[PDB]
Amino acid sequence: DSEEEIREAFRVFDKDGNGYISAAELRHVMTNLREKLTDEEVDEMIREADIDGDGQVNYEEFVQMMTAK
Ligand SMILES: [Ca+2]
Ligand SMILES: [Ca+2]
């Protein structure tokens, strides 16, 4: 709901600083943000979050990542 909200989270989610997050990288924060998760639950979420299906999530796609499903 805020342009800054997902923006500050990018420094928390993207450790490489390259502008994109992958399953293994997302898992690192997801296991603390949410519980009852397998590695596969993260990957299912990537496949549904990735609007263009290329295996990575950029800034605009990150907003959609959390509003998907
Ligand atoms: Ca990254
Ligand atoms: Ca993508």
**What is the 3-class SS of the chain, one letter each residue?**
CCCCHHHHHHHHHCCCCCCCECHHHHHHHHHHHCCCCCHHHHHHHHHHHCCCCCCCECHHHHHHHCCCC
Ligand number with the minimum distance to the CA of 57: 2
48 is written with which tokens? 């549904």
At residue 17, what is the residue type? G
Do 46 and 55 form a contact (C-beta atoms < 8 A)? yes
Span between the terminal Cα atoms of the chain, in Å: 17
CA distance 63 to 69: 13
> Is 50 assigned to a binding site?
yes
Output the CA 12–ligand 2 centroid distance in Å. Answer: 19
Do 1 and 38 form a contact (C-beta atoms < 8 A)? no
Instruction: Give the residue carrying structure tokens 């299912």.
Output: 44
Structural domains in the chain, CATH included, are 5-65 (1.10.238.10)
CA distance 32 to 50: 22
Output the CA 57–ligand 2 centroid distance in Å. Answer: 5
Output the CA 34–ligand 1 centroid distance in Å. Answer: 20
23: nearest Cα among 40, 35, 6, 10: 40
